[PDB]
Structure formats: structure tokens, C-alpha cells
Amino acid sequence: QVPTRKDYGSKVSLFSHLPQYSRQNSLTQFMSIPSSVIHPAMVRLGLQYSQGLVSGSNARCIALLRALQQVIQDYTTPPNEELSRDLVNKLKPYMSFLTQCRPLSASMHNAIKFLNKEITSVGSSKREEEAKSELRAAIDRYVQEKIVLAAQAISRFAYQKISNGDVILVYGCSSLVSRILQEAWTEGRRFRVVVVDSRPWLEGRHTLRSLVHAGVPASYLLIPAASYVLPEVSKVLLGAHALLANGSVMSRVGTAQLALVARAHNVPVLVCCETYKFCERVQTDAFVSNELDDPDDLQCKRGEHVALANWQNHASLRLLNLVYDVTPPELVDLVITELGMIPCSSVPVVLRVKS
């Protein structure tokens, strides 16, 4: 049986319903070196999630789907059994272990749902090798037409909204935004880009390193100084990790703050995302369901001391570093998908048309 991960540190009272794991503690200590309970692809993928080697939502979904393809190729049905439900029953513990390594995201949840619906739809008369080949082809087709073509269409649509000489503000690291900016610059547009980052991931330096390599003029600053630069900003472009049915945008921690400050400065806000990230569940805030990262990441060596070195030694001291937060629909103007540019409140409609 797969052991459970132990919580590290004392959690905030409001977040007692969420887990909090340390990066040092990995489940592999209590697993057989030749993987028997779970497939080696599953344990490798969980290891490279729990260690933070894969961060982007698209990257996480792609890696999960590739590992699932590996498992499907390696799968063999048992006698007196059929693939249709045995495959799902075998897959469930793998998803549980993956959640144990790190909580699932919207992209992975949608991918799991789609794969379950595809496997359940596999006819009983199908042959094992033919069924495996069909599942592999379906996964490849889903990846292609739900990431690559979606990104191309989104970039083409967003090209129109970008005019010459304007200033565009981005936030964090996101493949879709970087691709949009690079393709817009390549097509002939001339503009500056303002990059906003935040502690402790500091993932913005990712996309910045891309923009400099594309020749795009750029500017860099931390999130608190955004109010200083928003007067000269014309458009705001953000990446969304999830779109909720009520129009709320479930994204990185600083997204809602930047949207609020931009709205206060009277600057339009743009959001580009793929349809496969549209969830059906809703949440009104960032407290009911969120993610607690490693609290030790908050420590920063300023001067010659780390002010939060032995933070556990203070009984009444708690550390809190969310990973996600929710932006209300009123602070958003666009949702840019392969379907086109739609209002932020049209998310449920798409949810209906994709089924």
C-alpha cells in the first residue's frame, strides 16, 4: 500500500483543511526500488512534480499525458477481465499517488476526465493491442488539437488587439503569453513589454529571458511597484491557470492584485487561455480550495541574516505562501480562446458546446 505524506510545519488556522508538504520529504523512501505498487513512469513523474522540475500547467498536463501513454503501452489486461473498467480501476491509485506528490491542477483534472471518458467508451469487442493503439492515437490527437492549434489560434486572435507603440504588461511565467508576444513582434508590431514578478518563485525571469532573446524591448520590476508603472501601461495581458464556470479566473497569486490595480488605473485587462482549461466547478475565493507550497521558500537572506531561519522555534509564528487565487469576473474584460475573443462571463457557454 502507498503510504501517506506527512504535513510539514504548523498550518494557518484558516487553511487547516489543506495539506502542506516539504520538498525534502519524498514518498520514495517507503517504496520498493523496483516499482511494484505503481508504474515506474508514475513514480518518476511524481518525483519530478514534488521537486518542482515541472511548473507550467501545459507542461504538467503534457508530462502527465506522456506518462499515461507509457503506462497504457506497458499495460496488460488480466484474464477473466476486460480493459474497459479494469484500466480505470488500475489508474485510480496512480492518480491518488500523483495527488499525494503534489495537488492536481485544472489541466491535469481535465486530462484525467477526458482519458476516463475515452477508456470507458472503448468497446468490449476491441482487441487489446488495437485498443492500446487507439488510446495512444486519441491522446496524441487531444494533445495536438488542444494545445498547439489552440495556442496558434489564440496568438492569431491576440495579434489584432496589439497596436504599434503601445505598452503591454505581463505577469509570471506562461508559455501562451510568451508565444503571443513573440509572434506579434515577428509579424511586424513594435511595442514595449513590462514584466511583473513576485516572490518566491520569481518565474518572471523565465519569460523575460525569452523576450530578450526575441529582441523585444522589456522592463522588469517586482509586483509592489506595479502601481508606479501602470500610468504608462496601455494593455494588461495575463495568463490563467483555470477558468471557472462563474467567470472567475483561477490563476497565479498576483493575478487578481494586478487586475484590481489596473482597473483602478483605468487600463483594459486581457486574458488568454485554452478551452481545455475551462473547469465546471466554481469557487468564490482563494480559501476554500488552494495550494500550500513549501513554507521554507519564504526565507530570504537579507544582509547577513535570514530573519525567518528558525521560524518553527516561535510557537505563535506561521508562514503562508499560496499558489493560486481567484479574480472576480468584473475585473476581467477578455477571454481569448480558439473560439475567439469572448466576454469573461461566456465561460459556461463554451462549457456547454464542448460536450
Place this chain on the structure above:
Amino acid sequence: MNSQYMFDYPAINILSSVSYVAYNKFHTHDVSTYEHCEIPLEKLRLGFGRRNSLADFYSLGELPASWGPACYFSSVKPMMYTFQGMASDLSRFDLTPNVLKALSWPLGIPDCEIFSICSDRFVRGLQTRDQLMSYILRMGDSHSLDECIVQAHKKILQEARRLGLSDEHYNGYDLFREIGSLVCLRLINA
């Protein structure tokens, strides 16, 4: 996205023929039309206005939505091209000295189907698109159709200015008409 809708998709192959497949759905890129033929603007942009001298479009990287005789409202200022008489005269002449390398151009190899294309007894119908598009692809050196069209137009302009043929009198309203006129004139020369 009405400008992005498609009816027939041009499938290409590389003796450099072009087919049409039934494709009744919106395309990922804007499409222009010319003589019942559809060209996906996969690497260019759409144009506007009734400006003459079609070269002025792709010089900006754009390409007009529609033009040519099939368009009742051609935006490239249609004009006469008073050279199709010799095209009809030589239409029934088949493939079999100076004339060989005279008509090797503009393709660089002898070719006679151009006269049949420019012949009067050849209606610009829906069934003729295949041979027209295949010829325009073969006579160009690219993969997407719009680069083939622009290559054709600039090669026509190059050959016209080679003999000093009043490039102003050659806009590109009906590409194959200029093809036939140049072939007839250079066959008259040799």
C-alpha cells in the same frame, strides 16, 4: 469570422499538381478568392480598397480579398489586354528552333497548355480550378499558394521590364492573360 470560412481546400503535392477537397468549415487563416479559386492567406494579410496595380498589395504584405473577371466588382481596375487574339489563334497549335527556347520561358521548359487556358472556348468554371492552380503552383517555387501567386506576378513584371513592355500597362488583373500576352509577344520576337 466570415472571411475565414472555406468551401474547398487546396491540397498540394510536390508533377506539382493541386487538388481541391470538400472542406466546408471555418479555416484557421483568412482566405482570398480569384476565379472561383480559394487561396488561404497563411503567410500574408487581407487588403482593402479598389487600388490598381496589384503589385501595390503584396508590397505591403497584404493581398486583396477578391479580384479578376469572376469578381463583378474587381478592385484592381480591370482593363483590356488586347493580346488574346493571338492566344486564340495559337490555341489549337500543339507542342510539336528559336521558338523552343522562346516559349520555354516563363516556366523555363516548353509548355503549351497556357494557350488552351487563354483560349476563348475555355470557360472560367468550377471544374477548371484544378489545372489552373496546378500550373500556377508548378511555375512557382514555394509551398503555400500566395507565395506562388506573388512569385508569378513578380516574374511577369521582371519579364515585362526585360523587354520594356510598359509595366504600368501590366497590373495583374488576370494573371494568365499577361502570361498569354508575354508568350505571344516573345514568340513574335523569335
Place this chain on the structure above:
Amino acid sequence: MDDKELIEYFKSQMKEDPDMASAVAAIRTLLEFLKRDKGETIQGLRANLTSAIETLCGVDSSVAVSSGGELFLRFISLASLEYSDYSKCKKIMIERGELFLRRISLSRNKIADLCHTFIKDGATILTHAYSRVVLRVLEAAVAAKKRFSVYVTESQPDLSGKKMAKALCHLNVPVTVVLDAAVGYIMEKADLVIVGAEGVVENGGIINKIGTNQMAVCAKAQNKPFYVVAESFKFVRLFPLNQQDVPDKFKYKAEEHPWVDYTAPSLITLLFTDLGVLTPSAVSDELIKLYL
């Protein structure tokens, strides 16, 4: 026909019945062009139609003409998908266009019947400028034996507010003409605001005469309802981000005199169309369903 019977026929249709909107006349002219097409190709047919779109858009460049043209283009594409042969599909295009004209000719009556309930007795309506839909709705309300007052702005760039005030006082309704600058002064007396629309954008906002936005903004300050009456064919897949994002071919040509501005959907309470009574977010859905 070719580029001369188009404009003349469109103007004749507009002038013979001046109580009929520009978009309806444009759609009827497009149908007439389709009738006398004398060409046998679907691709060429759509090319000629889309050329007719901007040769008609040269005059009376209001957004309604463009919306009607886009609707006609989507209709002819939809029909083609349904069938296969230009020959046979031509007559079905013609009959579908006739039925479409018949259905859209009742939009005013349907909107009036739907919307007359929203006026209270003793109410005070506020109006920006002339719009036949508003006049029809108020006529329906009068036919219901209701009592109310009407304040109308004067629409300074062209004094059409006075024209609609004359047309309304012809109906024995107590009306009051006010300056375009007096809106903030006046609306505190107004019980609710009803305006027309020259086009509906993706999110739900409207595209209307220059003053409209101001009223809407002031309305949001006064917590008063803001109702917009517009037909179905006034939908378009345009999404301005701000006032300067709407295409300049609509702002000008009917030291800086625009003619049309955009109002965000957040300031709109309800849309009254021939499709029914909709929330501002509904329109996108409908306009999405047209292209899926």
C-alpha cells in the same frame, strides 16, 4: 447589376419608406442583388456579396449595415453547408431570404409587445435621440392607456431629438426637450432610461450616438435602470476595449467631431430584442451559436 443600381436601389428603398431602418434596407438590397446574380458559382457569389458589403458601407456607414452584411454572409454560408448544388441551392437561398425578411419585419411589433410592460404609470422616461424602436414602444405603452412623462436630449450634432419630440407630442404625450449637457441635471427626475442602439458588441455593450455613454455612466451613479431596445440583426463580432478601440470608419463621416461611441455591458440592465428580454451576457452566447 454593377455598382450603380446598388446605391440607387438602396437609397430608393430607404426613401420610399423612410420609417424603415438602414439595416433592413441593406439586407433587402443584398437579397435583390442575389436575385439578379446571373452567375453560377457559390464562391463567386460570396465574393460579389462581400464586395457589395463595402460598396454599400461607403454610404451610411452605421454599424447596422455591417452587422446585416455579416448576417447575410453567415446565412449564405449556412445554406451552402446544408445543401450541395448551386443550381438547386439558389431557389432555397431566395425562399430563405424571403422568410428572413418576413420574420425581421415584425421585430418592432414584437419588441413593443415585450417591452410595454416595463413602463409604470406616472413614470418618467429619459431618451437620448430619435429611434423608431423607442417610438413604437412608447406608442404601445400609450395604447395600454398609461400615464407618464418623457424627457429627451436634443442630440446637438444633428437636432434629431427635436424631431422625435415633435413626432411624440403629435401623439399627445407630455415631453420635455433638454440640452445634451443637462443630463446630469435632469435624470434625478427621471424614473428610468430607455435608449436605442445602432449595434450590439460581443460582451453586451452597445454602439450608439455620441452622448449615450454619458447617460449610462450617470445612470450608474444614480442607481437607475438602463434599458436598450434593438433588433436581432444589430449584432456584430466587434469587441472594443475602450472608446478609441471602435473602428474609426464608424466614429466619423456621420475640430474633433465623432458621431458614435461605445457603452460597456456593465452599465446595461436589460436588452429588449425580438429574441426576447436578455441579460447583457446573453448576446455573446447567441452570437457564438451562430458560428458553431
Place this chain on the structure above:
Amino acid sequence: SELSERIESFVETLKRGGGPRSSEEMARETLGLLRQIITDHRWSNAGELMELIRREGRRMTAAQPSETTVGNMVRRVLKIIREEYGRLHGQESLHKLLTSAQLQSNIIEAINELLVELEGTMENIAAQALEHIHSNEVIMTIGFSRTVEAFLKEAARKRKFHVIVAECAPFCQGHEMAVNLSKAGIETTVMTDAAIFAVMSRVNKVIIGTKTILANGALRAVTGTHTLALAAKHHSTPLIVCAPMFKLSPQFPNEEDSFHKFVAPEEVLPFTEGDILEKVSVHCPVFDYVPPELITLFISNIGGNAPSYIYRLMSELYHPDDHVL
């Protein structure tokens, strides 16, 4: 005959006083009554059945327009006949404009499955309740409504939080929720209406029920709900409405102003005052109109939804022709 007298008894009960207090009981009784109406009355074509249903629903609605569960259940049934007739013989949108005798058993089974799914709306709401309440939250409700009480008293099985209940004067039925919910160990508080804003700053989110939800997303609730929603919007606290699917009715606010329900002014002002009761006019409405701009979310037996999407649920429940009934 017997069905006719049962219908008359039902109408008299609605006119005088609601016997079955819960709205779910109203829905079940209305659907059952429609079932005997369909089985007993004779009809050849579907048109006469539809007009008979129109007449009966008109009578029942005219008995008491204050509550609309009967009306929209009748409209749902009418849509059921419309769908079955279209299926066995063969939605307004731009697509429609541009493009262009054995059904009794099907109707009966449709009504039966509708009753079956209506039975478990409370259970589905309770099942999805746990995803909107976090530990040590502060929740405020108004009046009495079984949906939200089941919601909270089951979601507290794995969480601990504080609940504030404001008595819905004059019908101080919030005390009933307070007692019932404190009988489950939730650490609740009993409060008057006049203090709502006074405490509204220190509340994380507010969950309320409703009596009827209109097409535009605006709803009709107990008196004082509009003030609570206004305070919520002022403090920007999210507002959750827990309403089963049958509480969705397709009318609109401005309809003859027979919207509220005025009861005897005895509750507000006792009869013992005496002489001053002549010159003084007293009003005691029991319902208030909450606009859709102050609503954040809708929780129903099918899940979460936004107010801006409510119109779509109208198209999937009620045919446009049957709004007038």
C-alpha cells in the same frame, strides 16, 4: 369527478393557508395532481391537453400568485408535452432565424422521473455544500429555509465555523434555525435585522435561500434580504443563494406589482394600540426584490452557476410561449 374535488380542495388550501409547508411538498403535490389530470381527462390531440393544462394552471396560479412553485411546475409539464410531441412527430436564436397518438406513457414516465430527480435535490445540494465552506469561516443567513440549514448542518460534520442568523421580523423564524442548528453543535448566534450592517464587516460570506428566482437573475426572498444584499455589495462579501431547480420561474419583476405579499398588519402593530390605528397606515410585506447585480453565485442540484447564465436555464425549462400561461 374525484380528481375535480381534489383539485378544488388543493385550490382552497392554497387560498386559505398552505397545508404542506415545504415548497418541495408543493412541487410533489402539483406534479401528482397533473399526473391524475393527464391519466383521467380524455383527449385526442395534444393541443386540447395543453389548453386544459393551461386552464388548470391558470386557476391554481390565480388562487395565490404570491408563490410560483405551482406555476413553474405547470410550465415544466407543458414543456414536457411539447418535447414529447416534437420527438414523436419530428429555442429561439439567430441560427433558427437564418436556417428557417400514444405519448401518454412517455408523459407519465417523464413526470415520474421528474419526481424522482426532484426527490434528491436537497441531498445533491448537501453533497456539493462542502466545497464552499472553509474552516473558521463566518456565515450569516436570514429567516428560515430548510435548504441552507441542511447545507450547514451537514457541512459542519468535518469543519468548524461560526454562523449568524438574523430573525426575519415580524415572523421571527430565524430563531427556529438558530435552535435547530445549535442542536447540532455549530456555535450559532441569534441577531435582529437592524444589526445586519452593524456586523456585516466581520462576516466572510453570506448564504441565503429564496422563494422564487426570476429570469433576469433577480430573486424574491423574505423581507430584509435586499438590505442584506446591499450590505454585502457594500462590503464586497460574496453572496451565495441555495435554491433547488424548481424555484426558477420565468416571469419578470414588472408584472402588475402583484409581486410582494401583504399580510395583516397585526404582526407589525398590535391591535391593542387603539385610537391611533385610524390615521396610521401600516404595511407588512413578506417578500423583497433582490436585483441580480448583488448576487455572486447560484448553487442548485446541478451545481454552481453565475447569475448571468440564469437565462439559459430558462430556455431549458420553459418554452417561450408558456410564459403568459
